[PDB]
Coordinates of C-alpha atoms in Angstrom, one line a residue:
X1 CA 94.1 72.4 80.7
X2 CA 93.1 73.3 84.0
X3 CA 97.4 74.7 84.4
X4 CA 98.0 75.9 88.1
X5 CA 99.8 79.0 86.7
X6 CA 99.9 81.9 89.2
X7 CA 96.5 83.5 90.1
X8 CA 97.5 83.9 93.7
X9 CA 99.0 87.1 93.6
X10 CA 98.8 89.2 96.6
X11 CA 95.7 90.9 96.8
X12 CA 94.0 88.0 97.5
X13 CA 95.8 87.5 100.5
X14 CA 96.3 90.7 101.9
X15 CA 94.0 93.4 100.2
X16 CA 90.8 91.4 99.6
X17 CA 90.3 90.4 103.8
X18 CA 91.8 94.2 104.4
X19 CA 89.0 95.8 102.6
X20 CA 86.7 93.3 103.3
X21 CA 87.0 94.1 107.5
X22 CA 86.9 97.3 107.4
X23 CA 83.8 97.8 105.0
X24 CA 81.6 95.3 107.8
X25 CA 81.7 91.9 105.7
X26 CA 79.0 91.0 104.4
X27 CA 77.8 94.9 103.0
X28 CA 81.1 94.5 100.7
X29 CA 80.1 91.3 98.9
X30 CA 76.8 93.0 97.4
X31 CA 79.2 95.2 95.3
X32 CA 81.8 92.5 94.6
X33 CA 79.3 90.6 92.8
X34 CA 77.5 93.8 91.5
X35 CA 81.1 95.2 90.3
X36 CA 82.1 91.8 88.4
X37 CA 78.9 90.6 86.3
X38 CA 80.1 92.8 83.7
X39 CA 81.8 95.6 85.0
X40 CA 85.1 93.5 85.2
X41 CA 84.9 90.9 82.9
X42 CA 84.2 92.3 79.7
X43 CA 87.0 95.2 80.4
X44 CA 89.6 92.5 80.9
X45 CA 88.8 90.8 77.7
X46 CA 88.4 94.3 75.9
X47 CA 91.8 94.8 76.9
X48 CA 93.0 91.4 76.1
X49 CA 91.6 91.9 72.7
X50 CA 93.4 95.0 71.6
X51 CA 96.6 93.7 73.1
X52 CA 95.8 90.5 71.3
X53 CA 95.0 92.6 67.8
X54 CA 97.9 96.1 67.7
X55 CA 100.5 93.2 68.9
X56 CA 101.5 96.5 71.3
X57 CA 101.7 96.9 74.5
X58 CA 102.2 100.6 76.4
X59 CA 101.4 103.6 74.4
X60 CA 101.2 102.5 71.2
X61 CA 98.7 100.3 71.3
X62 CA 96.2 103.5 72.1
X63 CA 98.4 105.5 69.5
X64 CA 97.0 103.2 66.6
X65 CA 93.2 104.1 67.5
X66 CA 91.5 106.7 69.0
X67 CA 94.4 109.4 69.8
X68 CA 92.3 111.3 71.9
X69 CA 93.1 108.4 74.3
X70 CA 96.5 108.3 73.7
X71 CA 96.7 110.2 77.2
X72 CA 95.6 106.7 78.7
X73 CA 99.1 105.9 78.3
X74 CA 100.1 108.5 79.9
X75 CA 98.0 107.9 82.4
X76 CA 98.9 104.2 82.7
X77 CA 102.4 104.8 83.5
X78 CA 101.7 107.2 86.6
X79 CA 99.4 104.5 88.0
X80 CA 102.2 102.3 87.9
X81 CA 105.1 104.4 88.9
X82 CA 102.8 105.1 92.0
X83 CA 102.5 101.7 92.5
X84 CA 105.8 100.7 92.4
X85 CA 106.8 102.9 94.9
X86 CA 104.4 101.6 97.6
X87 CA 103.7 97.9 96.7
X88 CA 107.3 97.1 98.1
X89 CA 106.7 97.7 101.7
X90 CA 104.7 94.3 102.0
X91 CA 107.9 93.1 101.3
X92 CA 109.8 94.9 103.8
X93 CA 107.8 93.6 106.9
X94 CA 107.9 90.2 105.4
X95 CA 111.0 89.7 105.4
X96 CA 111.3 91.3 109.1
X97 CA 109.4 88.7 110.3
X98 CA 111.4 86.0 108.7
X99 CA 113.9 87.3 110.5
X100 CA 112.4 86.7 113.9
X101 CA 111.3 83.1 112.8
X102 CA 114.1 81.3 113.0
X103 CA 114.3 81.1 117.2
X104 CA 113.0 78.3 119.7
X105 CA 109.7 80.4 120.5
X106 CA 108.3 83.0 118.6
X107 CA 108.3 86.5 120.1
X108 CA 104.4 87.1 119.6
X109 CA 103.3 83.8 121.4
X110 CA 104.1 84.8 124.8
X111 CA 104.9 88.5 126.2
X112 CA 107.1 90.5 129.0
X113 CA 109.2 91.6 126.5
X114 CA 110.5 95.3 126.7
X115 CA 108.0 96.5 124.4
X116 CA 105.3 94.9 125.5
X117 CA 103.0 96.7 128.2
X118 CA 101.7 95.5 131.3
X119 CA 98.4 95.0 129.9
X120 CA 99.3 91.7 128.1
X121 CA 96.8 88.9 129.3
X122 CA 97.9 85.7 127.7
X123 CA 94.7 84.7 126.2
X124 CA 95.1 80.3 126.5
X125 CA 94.2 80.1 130.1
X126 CA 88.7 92.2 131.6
X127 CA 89.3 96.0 130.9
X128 CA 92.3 96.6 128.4
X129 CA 91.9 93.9 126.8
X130 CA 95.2 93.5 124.5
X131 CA 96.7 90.3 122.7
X132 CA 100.6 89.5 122.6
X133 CA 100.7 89.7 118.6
X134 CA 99.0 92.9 118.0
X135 CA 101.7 94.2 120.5
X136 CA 104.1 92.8 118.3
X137 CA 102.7 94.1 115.2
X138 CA 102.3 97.7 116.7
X139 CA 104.9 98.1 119.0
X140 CA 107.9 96.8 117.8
X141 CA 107.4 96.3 113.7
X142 CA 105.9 99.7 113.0
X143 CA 105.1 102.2 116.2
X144 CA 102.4 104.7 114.9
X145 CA 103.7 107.8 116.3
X146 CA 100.4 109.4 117.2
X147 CA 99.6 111.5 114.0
X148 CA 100.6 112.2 110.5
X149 CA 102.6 115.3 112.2
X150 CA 105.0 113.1 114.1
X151 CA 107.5 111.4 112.3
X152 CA 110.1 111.0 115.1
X153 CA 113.2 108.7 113.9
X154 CA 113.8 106.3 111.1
X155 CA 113.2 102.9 111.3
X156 CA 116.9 101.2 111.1
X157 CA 116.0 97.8 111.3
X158 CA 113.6 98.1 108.2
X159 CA 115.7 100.4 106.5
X160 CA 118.1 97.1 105.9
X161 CA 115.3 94.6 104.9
X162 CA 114.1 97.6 102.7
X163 CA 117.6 97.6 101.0
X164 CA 117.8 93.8 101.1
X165 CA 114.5 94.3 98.9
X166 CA 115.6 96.4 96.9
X167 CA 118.7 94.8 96.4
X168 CA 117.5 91.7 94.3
X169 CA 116.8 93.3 90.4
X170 CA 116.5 91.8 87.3
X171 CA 109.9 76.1 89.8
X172 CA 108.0 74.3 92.5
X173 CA 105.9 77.5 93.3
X174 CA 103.1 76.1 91.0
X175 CA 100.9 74.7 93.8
X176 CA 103.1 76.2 96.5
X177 CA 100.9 79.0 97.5
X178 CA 97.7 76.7 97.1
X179 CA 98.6 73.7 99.6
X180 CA 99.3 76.3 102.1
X181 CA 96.5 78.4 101.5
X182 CA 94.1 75.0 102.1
X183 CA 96.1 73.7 104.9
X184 CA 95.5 77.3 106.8
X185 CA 91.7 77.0 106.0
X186 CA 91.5 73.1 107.0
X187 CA 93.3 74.3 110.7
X188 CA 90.8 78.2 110.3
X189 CA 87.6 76.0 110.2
X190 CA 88.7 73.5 113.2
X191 CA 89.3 75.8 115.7
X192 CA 86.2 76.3 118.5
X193 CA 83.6 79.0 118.2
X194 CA 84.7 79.7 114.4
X195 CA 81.1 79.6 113.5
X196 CA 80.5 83.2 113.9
X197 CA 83.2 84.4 112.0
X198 CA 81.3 82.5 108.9
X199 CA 78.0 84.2 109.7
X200 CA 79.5 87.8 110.2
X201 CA 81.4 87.1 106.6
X202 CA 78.3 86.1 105.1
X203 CA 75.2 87.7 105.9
X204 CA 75.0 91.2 105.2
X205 CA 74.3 94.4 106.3
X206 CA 71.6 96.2 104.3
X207 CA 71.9 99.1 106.2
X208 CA 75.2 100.0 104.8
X209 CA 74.6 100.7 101.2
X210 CA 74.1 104.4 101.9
X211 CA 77.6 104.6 102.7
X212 CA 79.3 105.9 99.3
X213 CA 82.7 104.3 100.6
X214 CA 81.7 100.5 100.3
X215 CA 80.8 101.4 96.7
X216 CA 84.1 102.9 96.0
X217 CA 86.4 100.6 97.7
X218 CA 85.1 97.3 96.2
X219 CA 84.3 98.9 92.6
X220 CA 88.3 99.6 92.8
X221 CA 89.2 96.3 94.4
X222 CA 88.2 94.6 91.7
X223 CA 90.3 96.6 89.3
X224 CA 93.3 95.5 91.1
X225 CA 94.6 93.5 87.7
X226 CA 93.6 95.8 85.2
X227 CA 94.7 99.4 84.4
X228 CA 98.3 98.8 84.7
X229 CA 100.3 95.9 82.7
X230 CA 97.3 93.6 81.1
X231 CA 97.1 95.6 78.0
X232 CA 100.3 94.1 76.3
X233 CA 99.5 90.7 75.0
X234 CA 101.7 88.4 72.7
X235 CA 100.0 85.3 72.1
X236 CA 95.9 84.5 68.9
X237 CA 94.5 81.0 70.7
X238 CA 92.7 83.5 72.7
X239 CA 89.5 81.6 72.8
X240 CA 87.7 82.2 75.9
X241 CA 90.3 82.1 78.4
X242 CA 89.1 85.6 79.1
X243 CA 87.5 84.3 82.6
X244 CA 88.1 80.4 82.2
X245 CA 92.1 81.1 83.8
X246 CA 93.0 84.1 84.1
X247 CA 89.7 85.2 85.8
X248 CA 87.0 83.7 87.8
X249 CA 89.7 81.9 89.7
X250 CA 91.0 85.4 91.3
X251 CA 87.0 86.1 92.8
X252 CA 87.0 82.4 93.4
X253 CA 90.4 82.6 95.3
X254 CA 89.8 85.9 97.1
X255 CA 86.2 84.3 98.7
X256 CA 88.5 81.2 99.8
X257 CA 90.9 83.3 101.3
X258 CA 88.2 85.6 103.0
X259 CA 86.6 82.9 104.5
X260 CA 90.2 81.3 105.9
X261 CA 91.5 83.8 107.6
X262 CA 88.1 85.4 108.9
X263 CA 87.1 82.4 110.7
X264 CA 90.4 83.2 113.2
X265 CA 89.1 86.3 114.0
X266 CA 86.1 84.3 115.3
X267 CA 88.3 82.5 117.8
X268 CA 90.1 85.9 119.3
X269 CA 86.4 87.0 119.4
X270 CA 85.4 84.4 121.0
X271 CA 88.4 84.0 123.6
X272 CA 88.3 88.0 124.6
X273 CA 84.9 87.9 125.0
X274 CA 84.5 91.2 122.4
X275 CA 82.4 91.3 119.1
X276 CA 84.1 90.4 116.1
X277 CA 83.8 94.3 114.5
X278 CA 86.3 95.2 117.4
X279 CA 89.1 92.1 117.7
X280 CA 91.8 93.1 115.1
X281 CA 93.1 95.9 113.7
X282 CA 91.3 97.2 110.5
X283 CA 94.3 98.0 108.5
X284 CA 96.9 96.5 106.2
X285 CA 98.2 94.6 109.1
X286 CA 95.0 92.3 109.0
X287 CA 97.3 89.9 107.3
X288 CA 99.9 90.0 109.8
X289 CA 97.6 89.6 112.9
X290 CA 95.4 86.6 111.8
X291 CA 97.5 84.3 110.2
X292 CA 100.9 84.4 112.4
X293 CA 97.6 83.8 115.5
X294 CA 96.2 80.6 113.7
X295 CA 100.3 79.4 112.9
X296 CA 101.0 80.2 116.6
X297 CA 98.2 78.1 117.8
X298 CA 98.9 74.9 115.8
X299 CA 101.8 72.1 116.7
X300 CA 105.3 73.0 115.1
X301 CA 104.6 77.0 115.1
X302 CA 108.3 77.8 114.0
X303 CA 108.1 75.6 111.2
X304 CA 105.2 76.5 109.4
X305 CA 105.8 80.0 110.5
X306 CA 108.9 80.7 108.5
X307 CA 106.8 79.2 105.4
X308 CA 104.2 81.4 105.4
X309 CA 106.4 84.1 105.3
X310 CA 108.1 82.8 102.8
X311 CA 105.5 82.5 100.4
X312 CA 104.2 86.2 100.9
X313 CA 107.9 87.3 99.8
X314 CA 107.6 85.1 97.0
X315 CA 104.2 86.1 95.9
X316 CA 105.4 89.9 96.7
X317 CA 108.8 89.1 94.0
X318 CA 107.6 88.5 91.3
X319 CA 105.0 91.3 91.2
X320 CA 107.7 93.9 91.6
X321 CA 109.8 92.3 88.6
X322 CA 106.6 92.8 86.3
X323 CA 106.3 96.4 87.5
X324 CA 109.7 97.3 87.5
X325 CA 110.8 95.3 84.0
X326 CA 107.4 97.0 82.6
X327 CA 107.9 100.6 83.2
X328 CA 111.8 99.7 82.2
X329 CA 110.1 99.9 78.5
X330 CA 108.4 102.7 78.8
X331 CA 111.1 104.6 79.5
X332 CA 113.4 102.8 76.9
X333 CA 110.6 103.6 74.9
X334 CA 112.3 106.1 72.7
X335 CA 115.3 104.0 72.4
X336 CA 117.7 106.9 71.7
X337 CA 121.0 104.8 71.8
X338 CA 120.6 102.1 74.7
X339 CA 123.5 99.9 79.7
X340 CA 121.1 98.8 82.1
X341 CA 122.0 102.2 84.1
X342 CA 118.3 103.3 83.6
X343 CA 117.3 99.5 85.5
X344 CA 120.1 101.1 88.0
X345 CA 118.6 104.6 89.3
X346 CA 115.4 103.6 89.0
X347 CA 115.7 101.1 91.8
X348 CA 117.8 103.7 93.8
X349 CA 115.5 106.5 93.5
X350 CA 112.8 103.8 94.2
X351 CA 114.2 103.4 97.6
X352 CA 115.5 106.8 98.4
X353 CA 111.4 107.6 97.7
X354 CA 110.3 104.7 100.3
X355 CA 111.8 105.6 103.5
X356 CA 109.4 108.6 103.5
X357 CA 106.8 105.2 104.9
X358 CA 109.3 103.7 106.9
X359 CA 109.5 106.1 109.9
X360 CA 107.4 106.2 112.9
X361 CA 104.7 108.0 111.3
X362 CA 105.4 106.4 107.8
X363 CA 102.8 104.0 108.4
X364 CA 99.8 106.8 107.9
X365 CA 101.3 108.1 104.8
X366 CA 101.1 104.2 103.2
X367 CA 96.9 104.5 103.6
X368 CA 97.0 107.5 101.8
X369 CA 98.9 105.9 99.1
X370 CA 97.1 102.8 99.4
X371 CA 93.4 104.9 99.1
X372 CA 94.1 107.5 96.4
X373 CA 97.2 106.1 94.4
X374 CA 96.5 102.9 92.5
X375 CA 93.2 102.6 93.7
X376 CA 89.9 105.3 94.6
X377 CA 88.7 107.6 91.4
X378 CA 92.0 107.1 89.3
X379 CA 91.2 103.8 87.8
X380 CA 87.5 104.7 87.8
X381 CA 88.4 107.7 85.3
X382 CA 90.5 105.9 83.0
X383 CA 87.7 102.7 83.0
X384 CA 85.3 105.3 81.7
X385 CA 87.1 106.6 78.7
X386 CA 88.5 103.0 78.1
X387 CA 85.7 101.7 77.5
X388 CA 84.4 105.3 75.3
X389 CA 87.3 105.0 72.8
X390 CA 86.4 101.1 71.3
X391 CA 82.9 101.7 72.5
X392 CA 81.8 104.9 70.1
X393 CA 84.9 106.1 68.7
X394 CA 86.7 103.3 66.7
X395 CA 83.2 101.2 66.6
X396 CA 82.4 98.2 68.7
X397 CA 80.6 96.3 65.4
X398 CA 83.8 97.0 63.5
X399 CA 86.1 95.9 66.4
X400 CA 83.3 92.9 66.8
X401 CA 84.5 92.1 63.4
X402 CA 88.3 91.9 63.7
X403 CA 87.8 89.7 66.7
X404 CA 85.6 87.4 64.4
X405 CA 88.5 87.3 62.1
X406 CA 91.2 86.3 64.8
X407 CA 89.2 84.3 66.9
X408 CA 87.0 82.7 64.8
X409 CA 83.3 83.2 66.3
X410 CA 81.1 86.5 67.0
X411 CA 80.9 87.0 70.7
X412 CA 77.4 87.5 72.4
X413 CA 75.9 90.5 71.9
X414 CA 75.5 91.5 75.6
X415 CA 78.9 92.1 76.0
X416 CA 79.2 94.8 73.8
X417 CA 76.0 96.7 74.9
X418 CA 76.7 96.6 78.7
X419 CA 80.6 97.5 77.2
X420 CA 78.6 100.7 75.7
X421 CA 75.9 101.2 78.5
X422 CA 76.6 99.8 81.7
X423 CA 80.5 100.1 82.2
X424 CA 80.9 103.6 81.6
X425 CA 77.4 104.6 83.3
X426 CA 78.2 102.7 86.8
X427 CA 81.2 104.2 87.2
X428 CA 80.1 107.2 86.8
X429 CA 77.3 107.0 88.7
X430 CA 79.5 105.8 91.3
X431 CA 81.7 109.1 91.1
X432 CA 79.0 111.7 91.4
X433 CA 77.6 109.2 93.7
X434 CA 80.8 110.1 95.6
X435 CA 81.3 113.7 95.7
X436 CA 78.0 114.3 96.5
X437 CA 78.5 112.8 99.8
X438 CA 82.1 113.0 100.6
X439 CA 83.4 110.7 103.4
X440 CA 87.1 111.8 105.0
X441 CA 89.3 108.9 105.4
X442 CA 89.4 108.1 108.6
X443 CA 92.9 105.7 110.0
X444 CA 90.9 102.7 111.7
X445 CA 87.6 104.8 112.7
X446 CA 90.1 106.3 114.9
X447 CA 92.3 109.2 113.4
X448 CA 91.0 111.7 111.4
X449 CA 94.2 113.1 108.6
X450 CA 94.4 117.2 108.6
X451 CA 93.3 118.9 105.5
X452 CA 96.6 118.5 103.9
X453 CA 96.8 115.0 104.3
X454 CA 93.3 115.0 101.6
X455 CA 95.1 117.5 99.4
X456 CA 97.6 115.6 99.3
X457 CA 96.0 112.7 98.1
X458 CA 93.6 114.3 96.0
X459 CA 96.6 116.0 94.4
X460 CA 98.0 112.7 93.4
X461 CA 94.6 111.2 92.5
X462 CA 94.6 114.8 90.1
X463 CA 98.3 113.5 88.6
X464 CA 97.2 110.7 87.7
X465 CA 93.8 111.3 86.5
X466 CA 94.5 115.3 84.3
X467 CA 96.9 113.4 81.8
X468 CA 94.1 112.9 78.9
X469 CA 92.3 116.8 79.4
X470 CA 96.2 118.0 79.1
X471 CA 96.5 115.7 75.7
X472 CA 93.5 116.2 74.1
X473 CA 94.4 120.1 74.9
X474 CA 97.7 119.8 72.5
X475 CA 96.6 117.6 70.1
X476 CA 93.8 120.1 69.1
X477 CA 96.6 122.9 69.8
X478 CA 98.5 120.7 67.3
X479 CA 96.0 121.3 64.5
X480 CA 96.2 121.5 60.8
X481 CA 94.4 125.1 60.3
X482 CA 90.9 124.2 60.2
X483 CA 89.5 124.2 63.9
X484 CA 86.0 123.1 63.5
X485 CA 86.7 120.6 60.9
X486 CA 89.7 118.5 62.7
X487 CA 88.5 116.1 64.2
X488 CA 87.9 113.9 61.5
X489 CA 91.8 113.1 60.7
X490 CA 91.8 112.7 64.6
X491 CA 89.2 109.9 64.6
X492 CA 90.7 108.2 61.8
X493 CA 92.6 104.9 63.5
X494 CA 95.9 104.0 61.6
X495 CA 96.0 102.6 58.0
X496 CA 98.9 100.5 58.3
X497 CA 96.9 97.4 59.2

């Protein structure tokens, strides 16, 4: 087969090297692989399974077993209407930049530009050190106000591309994404002193390890395409494409990616004369620093820099129409009568919600989202019951059975027992691991976000993670009239099959 498909995405791109930065390289790897032997695999193809099996995607599909875990559903759907929210202001300063691609000269290759500072040495031919496209990234895309307290104005020029986003609802991009991808790393590896951006990538730091955040981050990172719209299949043919397409390509992808873009930050490095920990900005801007460097300093620079662009907007445009069509049906879900007014206010509330990140000081409240929302403890929580319900509950030999019958052949037995042992046990090791060393989020090792900016986040982690205590709660409340003896009608999965 060997189809091109769309593994891409955009984590790959922008998270991976994001997280990657920040966390000191090579420390992060030792729990990417640590995270993915089978603590990622073997939950992507349980999930495949019983998508593959109930034919249901949503609810229903953890309605027909296990009901205590019908609040996984629940729990599901916030995940994704928080992501939703905040996984379309990538596309807002995408398209911003797009728009400032189509001149003779770029406005980030050169400076003495109004907001640009007087510290701006040009860097081709040394206190305040300070290069023309970070100055262009924080100055004039997004100007961090000095705190979570300021907000100052709103952002008019984003406000429109945020619109244009919005406003599109409802073919040769197969390789698209790839060539450019390769090209980049042909032109990231020729540059001069790139050889210690490879070695800071891939050696690692032992002594970081203690730190609980690496754990969390990369633990989390890797859950990136599971937990929110992978659990509705409707193929069987399953076979083993489990990791043959839809995985083992996305790690793969991610460590080509890494190793593209960090081997410009070797070159900045190696032109300011500062160590590579301290040459970019260790936010979600990473991707917006590196790459429009390494297309500025190639021939053709307007060219290939409205491509690039491009293809993040792309990458970004589909995502959103799986999100946004997905949580459509959850909603139509009851299906009392059903005018596409629903698709309608959804998008508009959508956008009236994201200009809250789109001020001055809108660009602190997107870490908070980024950290807690989506990502952190709240898919760590949901992995462990997961992975309890077919585990113990419904019966793993039983469910080993049914995948016999569809695919044809008994899986190895491994799977199942690190499915029963390992995957619930390291994640929960890594959540006490956790609070009993709590690390504030700090905004670039620089800012440090008042107490209320942690209760706030914790307080949407705590939406998205007390849906199944609250259902379990009722559905005992919900009880025939003998309290000890319930919960064997409970257990019972559906006999429709």
């Amino acid at each position: 087969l060997s189809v091109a498909g769309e593994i891409i995405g955009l984590g790959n791109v922008w998270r991976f090297p994001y997280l990657c930065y920040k966390n000191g390289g090579g420390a992060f790897l030792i729990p990417y692989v640590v995270f993915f032997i089978c603590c990622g695999i073997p939950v992507f193809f349980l999930e495949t399974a019983l998508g593959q099996f109930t034919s249901e995607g949503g609810i229903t599909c953890w309605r027909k077993v296990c009901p205590l875990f019908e609040g996984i559903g629940y729990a599901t759907q916030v995940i994704e209407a928080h992501l939703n929210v905040y996984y379309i202001i990538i596309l807002a300063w995408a398209i911003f930049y797009l728009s400032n691609c189509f001149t003779t000269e770029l406005p980030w290759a050169t400076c003495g530009h109004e907001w640009n500072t007087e510290n701006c040495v040009e860097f081709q031919k040394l206190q305040n050190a300070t290069s023309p496209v970070m100055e262009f990234w924080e100055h004039r895309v997004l100007a961090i106000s000095d705190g979570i307290e300021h907000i100052g104005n709103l952002r008019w020029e984003l406000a429109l591309c945020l619109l244009a986003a919005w406003t599109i609802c409802y073919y040769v991009t197969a390789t698209f994404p790839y060539i450019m991808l390769l090209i980049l790393l042909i032109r990231g590896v020729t540059l001069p002193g790139a050889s210690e951006g490879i070695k800071f990538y891939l050696y690692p730091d032992l002594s970081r390890l203690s730190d609980p955040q690496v754990w969390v981050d990369a633990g989390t990172q890797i859950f990136f395409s599971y937990a929110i719209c992978l659990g509705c299949l409707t193929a069987n043919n399953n076979c083993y494409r489990d990791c043959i397409m839809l995985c083992c390509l996305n790690s793969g992808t991610s460590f080509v990616a890494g190793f593209a873009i960090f081997s410009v930050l070797g070159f900045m490095a190696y032109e300011q004369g500062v160590p590579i920990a301290e040459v970019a900005e260790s936010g979600p801007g990473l991707a917006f620093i590196a790459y429009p460097k390494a297309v500025t300093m190639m021939p053709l620079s307007p060219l290939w820099a409205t491509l690039f662009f491009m293809m993040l907007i792309f990458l970004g445009l589909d995502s959103q129409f799986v999100c946004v069509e997905s949580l459509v049906t959850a909603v139509v879900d009851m299906y009392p009568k059903v005018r596409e007014l629903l698709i309608l206010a959804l998008s508009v509330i959508s956008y009236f919600l994201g200009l809250v990140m789109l001020t001055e000081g809108g660009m602190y409240i997107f870490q908070l989202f980024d950290s807690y929302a989506a990502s952190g403890m709240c898919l760590l929580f949901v992995a462990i019951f997961e992975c309890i319900c077919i585990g113990w509950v419904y019966g793993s030999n039983r469910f080993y059975d049914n995948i016999e019958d569809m695919i044809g052949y008994r899986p190895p037995s491994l799977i199942k027992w690190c499915w029963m042992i390992m995957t619930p046990g390291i994640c929960a090791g890594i959540f006490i691991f956790f609070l009993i060393k709590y690390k504030p989020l700090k905004y670039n090792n620089i800012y440090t976000y008042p107490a209320w900016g942690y209760g706030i986040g914790w307080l949407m982690a705590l939406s998205s993670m007390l849906c199944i205590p609250l259902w379990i709660c009722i559905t005992v409340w919900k009880t025939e009239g003998t309290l000890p003896e319930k919960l064997q009608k409970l257990t019972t999965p559906s006999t429709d099959l």
